[PDB]
Amino acid sequence: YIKAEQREIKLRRLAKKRNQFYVPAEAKLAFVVRIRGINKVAPKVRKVLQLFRLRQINNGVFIKLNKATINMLRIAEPYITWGYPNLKSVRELIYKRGFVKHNRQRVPITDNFVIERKLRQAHQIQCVEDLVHEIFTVGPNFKYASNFLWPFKLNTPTGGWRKKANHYVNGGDFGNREDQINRLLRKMV
Amino acid sequence: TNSKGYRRGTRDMFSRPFRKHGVIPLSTYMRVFKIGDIVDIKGHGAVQKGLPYKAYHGKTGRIFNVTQHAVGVIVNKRVRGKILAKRVNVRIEHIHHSKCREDFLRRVKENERLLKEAKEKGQWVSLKRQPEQPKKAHFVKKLEEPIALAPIPYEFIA
Amino acid sequence: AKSKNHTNHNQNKKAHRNGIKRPLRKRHESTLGMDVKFLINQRYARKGNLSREESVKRYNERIASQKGKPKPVTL
Amino acid sequence: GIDINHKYDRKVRRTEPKSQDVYLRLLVKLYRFLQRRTNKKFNRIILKRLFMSKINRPPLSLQRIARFFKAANQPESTIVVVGTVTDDARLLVVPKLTVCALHVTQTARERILKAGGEVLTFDQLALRSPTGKNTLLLQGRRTARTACKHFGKAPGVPHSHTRPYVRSKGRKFERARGRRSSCGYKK
Amino acid sequence: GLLKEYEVVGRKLPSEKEPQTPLYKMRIFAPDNIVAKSRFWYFLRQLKKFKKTTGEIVSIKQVYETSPVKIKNFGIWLRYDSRSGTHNMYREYRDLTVGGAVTQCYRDMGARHRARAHSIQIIKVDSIPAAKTRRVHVKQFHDSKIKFPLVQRVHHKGNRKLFSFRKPRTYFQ
RNA sequence: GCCAACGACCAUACCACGCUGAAUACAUCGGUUCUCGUCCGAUCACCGAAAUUAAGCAGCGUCGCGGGCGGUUAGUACUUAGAUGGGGGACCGCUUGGGAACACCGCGUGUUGUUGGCCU
RNA sequence: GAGGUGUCAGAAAAGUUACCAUAGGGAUAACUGGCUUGUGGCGGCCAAGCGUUCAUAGCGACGUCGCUUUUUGAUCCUUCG
RNA sequence: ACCUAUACAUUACCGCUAAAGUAGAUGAUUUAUAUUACUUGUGAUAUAAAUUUUGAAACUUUAGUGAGUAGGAAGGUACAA
RNA sequence: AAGAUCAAGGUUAUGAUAUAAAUGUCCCAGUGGGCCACUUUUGGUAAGCAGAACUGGCGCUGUGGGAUGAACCAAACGUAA
RNA sequence: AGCUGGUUCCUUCCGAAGUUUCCCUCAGGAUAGCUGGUGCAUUUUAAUAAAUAAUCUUAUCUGGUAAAGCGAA
RNA sequence: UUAUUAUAUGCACUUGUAUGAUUAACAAUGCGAAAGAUUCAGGAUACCUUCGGGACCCGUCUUGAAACACGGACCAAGGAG
Description:
Chain C: One of its GO terms (molecular function) is structural constituent of ribosome. Chain C: It comes from Drosophila melanogaster (Fruit fly). Chain C: Keywords: Phosphoprotein, Ribonucleoprotein, Ribosomal protein. This is part of a larger assembly, with chains A, B, C, D and E. Chain B is of the alpha+beta class. Chain B is built from two helices and six strands. Chain B has a five-stranded antiparallel beta sheet, with no helix packed on it. Chain B is extended and about 65 Å long. By secondary structure, chain D is an alpha/beta fold. In chain D, strands 1, 2, 3, 4 and 5 form a five-stranded parallel beta sheet that branches. The relative contact order of chain D is 0.12. Chain E has helices at residues 33-47, 98-112, 136-139; strands spanning 4-10, 24-30, 59-62, 72-82, 85-95, 120-128. In chain E, strands 2-1-3 form a three-stranded antiparallel beta sheet. A three-stranded antiparallel beta sheet of chain E has the order 5-4-6, with helices on one face. In chain E, strand 4 and strand 5 form a beta hairpin. The longest helix of chain E is centred in the first third of the chain and has 15 residues, at 33-47. Chain E is elongated and about 80 Å long. Chains A and B meet through strand 1 of A and strand 6 of B. Strand 1 of chain A pairs antiparallel with strand 6 (138-140) of chain B, so a sheet runs across the interface. Chain A binds six RNA strands through residues 36-45, 47-48, 50-53, 55-59, 61, 63-64, 66-72, 74-75, 77-78, 97, 99, 102-108, 110-111, 143, 146-147, 150, 153-156, 159, 162-167, 169-170, 172, 174-175.
């Protein structure tokens, strides 16, 4: 993780010195949290929300940023605010807010051991933090890891703008606000 | 009250579109249709025998019968409301092989090549199709000169 | 006393409730409109097959003794 | 705004047999102790197989006990039937086995005991074989019942062979219009 | 409304068979990194097709006011949309900030014309050196020997007493 | 290359106006016993002797006529999705996705399967 | 197979009730109110012309925008125990 | 910046659904010790102390959720015999 | 051409999910009088008008908000801090 | 009497439809659709997936609306 | 080569930390003061008072009922899947 921050910083440093613009690798991994209803929602979007598992307002899941997913988030836009989550934020969410799906039932965590509990077959994953590595990095067992978490259910952040249903451009909320989510998300936990 | 006959709204469904006019040229038959192959139904209105009833145009089925001058294609058609399966006997003059299936077959052969190639490289396979990810650290070199130019606008003019 | 003829309102809600429900890729293969003949010698096919390791081996031994068929594919 | 905790969360299947029978539940209680305590699926399904309604429990006949003997790797076998066991007159030769059953009809008990087999209660099969060793679990023919015939009663779609719900069978009882091509339509 | 100035660049997708789609840039006034991209496509569309997500963003970067203590006159050239009526302006603003100029612009445009922030398009930015300031209000500021009366005041309410017994006292001498 | 027969795709193969077409040849083109078909041996049937690549057909040319494709036109038009956005309304900006058409411009003016022959 | 029910998945059927009766209906007329405002009434905008001259003192084509709801239709929301 | 729905977060608690165990007591389990065996340290046994008699057609234990007419099912309550 | 016997195959060959799903019986009630809004529209000058297309509500829905209000907005309500 | 009026305790849980078709049908039924209940068979979609269902995406088809056209029929 | 971190750190005792809903150390006060009975805490019982906020008439047909829709003055008892 620490090395990962240094690689990005150094690429930027070396380029700019050589006159070169190295434009840094486009972001993987989004966190999606539900601002909207369920009631007074169009059915296309209602269906998309169930599949995401986002059952209630301010419940949030991690969703792999793919060409597949991003189109569902587009029809879901006025219903969702989403961004790129920092590692601090993922760590704050799992340890306090992170429950497990074991035969329906939504089951604590907090133990390393209960995360070893399943995910040791997805090797090198025997810890609470090792689950968040897998989420963060979009590791190959992301399907099961994301599934294992039952949607984290998160208070409200902080003064969350009256206009609500406007694209983030318009001062709204709703949008891929990019890196500005880190301020939001950390406060909402 | 209503629409109802069979040919309702089929002015443009059964229209031969400009410069494709006349007698259905022989290649259509030459294609061998074999049971279990995926077929698309495209209404050719110049071949008036074995007409695929208007709901079945661009609804595509798999072949479960080959009969002397008809191909019986099982299209699954959404009813109000219980998806019943219909065997429609339609002619090859209206029946064109879907190359939706070939994409699958091309994949088997390609997957087997990648598998073999990887195994002879020792490691690693990863032959499953991943959709276009947010890519890469992109370096733009001037070359051929720095950028910049902004834009617009005087766009009056009625 | 003008009532209202025809709304397809709520029909599509109705359908998804207990799913419109696709049937099966039957490995156990359904028939109808097979031109009676294939069916007759399909019946015979199953019957005459009686089982089979010796049957295939004896007719392979016939094919090597006869060899057989340069003519059929070209005609 | 729960999207969506609709249904079904009521599910399907009996925890406990729908029967007042004090005997029956003791077997359930016995095999329920044997379930998790000794692993193995013979305990798991026999517990379930006691839950079973009278339909889904339809009587297994003695000739079905005798055809199972003709099976390979089956000669030393204590045939399990969670069911009523019914006497089939037509089997001339009834083979030796011990048969464990809920109930055995008195004519069926004589042809097992003549064979010379033992008619056994499941609690004594549980003692003998808590590991379900050398059993064979037989389930009856549910397709036999007159109710199953009647379902699907539909005319149109080239079907049914279903039996119309008829108090009396004869001429002038539903032979006419709609059974035959003559009086308008074929079924 | 927070007026931050942003350099945004966007190429139009990437094929290896198909070289090096040309690189356009813009200066964008946005509170928001996202609004920087949002406006950027809309203005890019006006010359050069390029729909996002057949569109490649590229880099979003904020640019650095060169002189925020610096005492300069800016002319901005502006297009606005009126109800039946889209027209062009030149107005000149004396501000610290190119950021501060635009923020004072959206407010001023908003006021007088009823000037929609969505109905306003920027156009162009230049710093006016030196008597090219048509600007009658502006050129008053350029004047040797710029002394000016303080006209009036502004009475904090009331006081640190809600109860002000010492009477304000509009006097001030 | 050309030519034939048999064709696929189906106007880059058409159209118009010229020029050219060697050879195995299509064709041009002749004869009318017979079979056969026609009012008429024009077609059609037959015999294949004398001429000719002008035509058909093919190719070659043409800033043609037409036809194809791409860009340009145009991210516009138009439209999905959003707002306790605007406008009196008619409607219109913005914002998230998708995306034309005529036109103009450029470049091409049949390609190829089987099978036989000819080869300048 | 045919002969047919066109109310065409198939009764065999004439008026009148202001002498009337019932069960109901604001799912429904008449009628108040409400929407509408074509139609009606009232008021403008532009202004070719009238008006000796001079478009608007008073008027005003061809056009065009309204307001009123007091005309008449359009409607049936409410009202037919 | 502030205010604020039965929304949203957490918690106790109701119910319903879910998910798991519970049913060697002539026995089991815990605790302390004396003896004995092995070994550092553990078990066996003896003794003393303590817990345990489960509507096991229920409890202990667990989690997620609850608008509601028409209607359906489930479980009680009251009344006369 | 089917039935199909036999042998070969690195990673199962888009993405999230599954509140488990599929299936049968009852031939079960209740319904067969809808109403409203975004968008799209036909008749009509138009209507709180007559009638579609898609989708959501209201019907069966309070609470908070729009001063008010069946339907619009926000939101679906066990009981409380 | 297809009509009007009324129908007698509670709680818990789930929870509609004004649509289709036929009917002297159109103030109503039957019928299909929506609804509950009863369950059943299997859970790699099950008890200490290389089997799917159905929504994105992708790949592969269809269409004569919006727009455009009339120096195109 | 250096730093950092973990393992090689056992046994006794422990009001040490947690043990997955970990509120109690510590202390004060009322008081159970025999029967008798003081004093403290707590309460939308009936009902009164004082303050805020909310509460339109049920049954019903109906798209929608507080309706300037219909029955019902009030009460008991018979009284209908």
